[PDB]
C-alpha cells in the first residue's frame, strides 16, 4: 500500500480525563462525561509511539510503606 507525505503542521494530540470516574473520552470540545456523567472535564496531553500507546505524566503520589519481617525454622531434640 503506497503512501505519500506532505508538509505536516504542528499537532497536539490531547484528551479529556474525567475525575469522579477518571475516564478519558476522545473529545476536545465535549463538556460532559459518559462514564459517570460529570459536568467538568480536565484537559490532558498525551504522547504517541510508533507502536501506538498513550502516556500521561502524572504527579507522584504519597505511597507510604510498612516494615518487613523474617521467617524461622526448627528441628528435632534428641533420640
Q: Taking CB under 5 A as the rule, does residue 25 contact Zn ion?
A: no
Q: Taking CB under 5 A as the rule, does residue 42 contact Zn ion?
A: no
Query: Given candidates 13, 14, 21, 48, which one binds Zn ion under the rule CB under 5 A?
Result: 21
Read out DSSP for 14-49?
EEEE-SSS--EES-SS--S-SSS--S--EEEE-B--
| DSSP symbol at 75 | -
Q: Taking CB under 5 A as the rule, does residue 33 contact Zn ion?
A: yes
Distance CA 26, CA 7 (A): 25
What does the binding site for Zn ion look like in residue numbers (CB under 5 A)? 18, 21, 33, 35-36, 38
Binding site: residue ranges? Answer: 18, 21, 33, 36
Amino acid at each position: 500500500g503506497s503512501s505519500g507525505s506532505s508538509g505536516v503542521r504542528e499537532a497536539r494530540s490531547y484528551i479529556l480525563r474525567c475525575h469522579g470516574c477518571f475516564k478519558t473520552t476522545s473529545d476536545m470540545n465535549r463538556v460532559f462525561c459518559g462514564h459517570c456523567g460529570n459536568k467538568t472535564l480536565k484537559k490532558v496531553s498525551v504522547t504517541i509511539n510508533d507502536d501506538g500507546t498513550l502516556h500521561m505524566h502524572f504527579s507522584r503520589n504519597p505511597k507510604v510503606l510498612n516494615p518487613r519481617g523474617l521467617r524461622y525454622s526448627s528441628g528435632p531434640s534428641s533420640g
